[PDB]
Design brief:
part of a larger assembly, 6 chains, A alpha+beta (56), B alpha+beta (110), C mainly beta (103), D alpha/beta (150), E mainly alpha (117), F alpha/beta (142), C: 103 residues, mainly beta, two-stranded antiparallel ribbon, E: 117 residues, RNA-binding, mRNA 5'-UTR binding (chain F), zinc ion binding (chain F), Ribosomal_uL13 (chain F), Ribosomal_uL13_bac-type (chain F), mRNA binding (chain F)
RNA sequence: CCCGGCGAGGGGAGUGAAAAAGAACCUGAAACCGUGUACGUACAAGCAGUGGGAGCACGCUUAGGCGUGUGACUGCGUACC
RNA sequence: GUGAAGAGGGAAACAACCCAGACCGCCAGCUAAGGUCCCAAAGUCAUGGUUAAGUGGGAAACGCGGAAGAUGUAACGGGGCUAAACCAUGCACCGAAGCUGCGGCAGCGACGCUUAUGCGUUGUUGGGUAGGGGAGCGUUCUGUAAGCCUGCGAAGGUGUGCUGUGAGGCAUGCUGGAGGUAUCAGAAGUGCGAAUGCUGACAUAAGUAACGAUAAAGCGGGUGAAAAGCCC
RNA sequence: GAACUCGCUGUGAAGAUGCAGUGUACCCGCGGCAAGACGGAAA
């Protein structure tokens, strides 16, 4: 079980077509501070769903 | 008057960077850090520093109007490979190849 | 209005005013030769042929330029018998213009 | 080639090419197979062919108007301004002065002028008659070249 | 005297690679496959010049019989009609006249039927 | 002067309704497949599909000759386990009369995208009525 | 001077004729990997070429169907020693 | 006789079967074997008979039978044909690189211009392995050469255009930034596509295996831009 | 070696991914199944 020919750039490029990614597009705006984040996640400064949290 | 920001000899492979660099092509600069900041790959950390370098050159070395810039030129090239050895079974001398990177991103307002 | 004639061994369907291609002849560049050999006269009611070479038709051909055509290479190869050769050829040509057909 | 007769790899064991020595001519820094030896490149010339060739080239320099014979060509002192000033009086720059015996004044000032060369009657060469344009004989050197070729 | 080969090899391959432009990858870039690619392309370009007068003759016989069936005559009766009608017109003019003037070629078919028998 | 090559977009093709009721199968099918080629037109080009539109109506009442009602048995393989698909002629007329026409006309066309492109323009029906009467068809007497 | 980690790598200014001479430093082709633009391909079968050839894009003649790239479709064609 | 040392067309395909010896180009025409229903270029052509079985489209001795072929119809090439099969005659056509005319190049014979031999021309030849013979291209160095070009831009690299039947040459866009070298001759370490050739770089499988005994980690705090591995 | 790498009938330096004909098949992946492979090995 070993290859007998060289795979080309077309086989490799058509093989790597399913390895791409996409944008997150989940940025929500916190109503308290006016900063963006992910949905169901927290901000950097310490705000979640408009409610202030620990923020150490 | 354009802005050139490039990185030589990154601690990464030549292939995995191009999975990240194809995402931010043609996007607005102000929303590009919003994508690359919360992107989960290691290569997004380097290109965030490259892009924030280009924004800083658009502030200090350019006149004004940072917001209306668009990401136009982006391409990732491979560099030299680092050659070392690695032990295996049956005592043969296996060579290994370490990839380096060259990320040349040119951004401008027009 | 077109005309049918044979000059270089092959026939041509050439109207007036058109610059058309013919074989290499011994004609000066300031000469305007006449071809009495015609095979069809084109009008609203055409003049066909029972026998060729209508006497009433004449063709006025003028020559503007001589030269050689496009470079075409010729490759003769034989597999596994130790034989290959390559040669080129640029064929001569004449560009003529036809003005006026006597019907 | 400074090296060894040791095989770089054995015949069996590996899937490499055939190896008998590291000094193979088809390898890097190996010995040249058809390398040259120090050899003399001179070859025999017949005497009648040589002197006949001198008769052939001096039969041609008299026809090509490249042959000028003067009365007395000498110099007073070993002074190149007196030599080149005399050649300036007859407008000759690239000539070959052939004369009689060796002159202490003339031969001492010969090396600083490249286009002007002087020699003696017994040391004439056929290559000095082609690369130089005109040849200047002396009246006494006319008898010496006739007995020289003969 | 030792002479190098680096000035004649690449300049030698300039003429090959300028004729190896546009051949899908290895026949364009790799010299080993490009050499037999140019050689074999010389074979097909040599043969198809001799097949051009076959294919255009096939198109002319196709278009003369293709325009002769609207008048109710076959091809072999039309060629024999022009040959016994002393017509020296070849097949290129017959193939060209079917494009521009239809009643001219219809007059050629009727003239061929006039001197047919 | 170069040989005239026709534009595929400006091929002036027409509709032709041909009633195959009471005709020989292969002798008419050869002509119909020959007119799907476009050879009957004067402006024929071997790489430009100049075949006209041919409508075949009532193929179930075609005139069979000889013993060809029983003789022709069509066989086809589907791309599966090695059992072969047999079909007698009297059942192929009984269940799908157009498919018999598709075998002959598809067989008489060259292999390739151009041949199946000429097979697209074959419209064989079973009933007398159709929906191509709106485009002003011209019946062909043959 | 700025960003970048009191990193690495650059941007700007300046020297230098030149930094497509920046210490990996003269000239830098190919195999290899990329990015921008014109075209074609997601119903189509075979040494992948060649002959014909539709459309699209760009400079020209101040049109005269010019030239280059792309090759829908089609005839033929089973690598080298 | 052919292949070996022959290209092309037909026999579905098929070196040795049949026709037929490729100097080159041409969107000219005429032919040999083989064909004129489509695929696939040309007759659904004329006349006289046979065939009822698709025999044609695989078969002896023997009285249309004798008769059993293979992944898939698959024993005409395929559709399909009652002639579009079989026997004979006639007329045209398709049909190769065969043949002719036009355009061009080279050699060998005989002349005539007449004499360092070039031709107004003349018929003819030009498939090719092993092998022989003749005429040519380019690179390094040297005499030519203290000559030519050149910082108004040398070698090298990289494209277009022109030209030569050829290896080549010519000028020019850009990079480069300092040497190259006309013609005539000589001296070769002289022309790469392979020798499981050698030295450096680079793809390929491909971001696939694997990340090292199966003693197992969890949590808080401090520096640091960033801590599952490190400081407590 | 290059691949834009399907299956059947026959041909064939002798069981064809490449030849003549026919048939199927949107493009590209992913994970297994090891029948095809001159891959170790079983005469």
């Amino acid at each position: 079980a070993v290859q007998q020919n060289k795979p080309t750039r077309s086989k490799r490029g058509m093989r790597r077509s399913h390895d791409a990614l996409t944008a997150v597009t989940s940025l929500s705006v916190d109503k308290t501070s006016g900063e963006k984040h992910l949905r169901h996640h927290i901000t950097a400064d310490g705000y979640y769903r408009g409610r202030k949290v620990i923020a150490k | 008057m354009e802005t050139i920001a490039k990185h030589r000899h990154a601690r990464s492979s030549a292939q995995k960077v191009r999975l990240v660099a194809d995402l931010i092509r043609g996007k607005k600069v102000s929303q590009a850090l919003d994508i690359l900041t919360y992107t989960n790959k290691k290569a997004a950390v380097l290109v965030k520093k490259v892009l924030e370098s280009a924004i800083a050159n658009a502030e200090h070395n350019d006149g004004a109007d940072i917001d209306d810039l668009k990401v136009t030129k982006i391409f990732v090239d491979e560099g030299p490979s680092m050659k070392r050895i690695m032990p295996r079974a049956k005592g043969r001398a296996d060579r290994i190849l370490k990839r380096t990177s060259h990320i040349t991103v040119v951004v401008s307002d027009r | 209005m077109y005309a049918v004639f044979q000059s270089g061994g092959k026939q041509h369907r050439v109207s007036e005013g058109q610059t058309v291609r013919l074989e290499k002849l011994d004609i000066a560049t300031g000469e305007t030769v006449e071809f009495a050999e015609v095979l069809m006269i084109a009008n609203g009611e055409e003049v066909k042929i029972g026998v060729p070479f209508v006497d009433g038709g004449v063709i006025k051909a003028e020559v503007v330029a001589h030269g050689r055509g496009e470079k075409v290479k010729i490759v003769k190869f034989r597999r596994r018998k130790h034989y290959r050769k390559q040669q080129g050829h640029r064929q001569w040509f004449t560009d003529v213009k036809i003005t006026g057909i006597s019907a | 080639v400074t090296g060894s007769g040791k095989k770089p790899w054995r015949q069996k064991g590996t899937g490499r090419a055939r190896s008998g020595s590291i000094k193979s001519p088809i390898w890097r820094s190996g010995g040249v197979t058809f390398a040259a030896r120090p050899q003399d490149h001179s070859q025999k010339v017949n005497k009648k062919m040589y002197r006949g060739a001198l008769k052939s080239i001096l039969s041609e320099l008299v026809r090509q108007d490249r042959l000028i014979v003067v009365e007395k060509f000498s110099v007073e002192a070993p002074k190149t301004k007196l030599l080149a000033q005399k050649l300036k009086d007859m407008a000759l720059e690239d000539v070959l002065i052939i004369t009689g015996e060796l002159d202490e004044n003339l031969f001492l000032a010969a090396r600083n002028l490249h286009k002007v060369d002087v020699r003696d009657a017994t040391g004439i060469d056929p290559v000095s008659l082609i690369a130089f344009d005109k040849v200047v004989m002396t009246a006494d050197a006319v008898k010496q070249v006739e007995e020289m070729l003969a | 005297a030792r002479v190098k080969r680096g000035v004649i090899a690449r300049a030698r391959h300039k003429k090959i690679l300028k004729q190896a432009k546009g051949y899908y990858g290895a026949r364009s870039r790799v010299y080993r496959v490009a050499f037999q690619a140019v050689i074999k392309a010389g074979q097909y370009a040599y043969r198809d010049r001799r097949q051009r007068k076959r294919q255009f003759r096939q198109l002319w016989i196709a278009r003369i019989n293709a325009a002769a069936r609207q008048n109710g005559i076959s091809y072999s009766k039309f060629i024999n009609g022009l040959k016994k009608a002393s017509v020296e017109i070849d097949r290129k003019i017959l193939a060209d006249i079917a494009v521009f003037d239809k009643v001219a070629f219809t007059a050629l078919v009727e003239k061929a039927k006039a001197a047919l028998a | 002067m170069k040989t005239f090559t026709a534009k595929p977009e400006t091929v002036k093709r027409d509709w032709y309704v041909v009633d195959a009721t009471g005709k020989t199968l292969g002798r008419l099918a050869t002509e119909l497949a020959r007119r799907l080629r476009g050879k009957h037109k004067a402006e024929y080009t071997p790489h430009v599909d100049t075949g006209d539109y041919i409508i075949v109506l009532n193929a179930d009442k075609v005139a069979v000759t000889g013993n060809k009602r029983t003789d022709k048995v069509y066989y086809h393989h589907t791309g599966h386990i090695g059992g072969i698909k047999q079909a007698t002629f009297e059942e192929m007329i009984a269940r799908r009369p157009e498919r018999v026409i598709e075998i002959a006309v598809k067989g008489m066309l060259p292999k390739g995208p151009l041949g199946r492109a000429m097979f697209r323009k074959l419209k064989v029906y079973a009933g007398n009525e159709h929906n191509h009467a709106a485009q002003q068809p011209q019946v062909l007497d043959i």
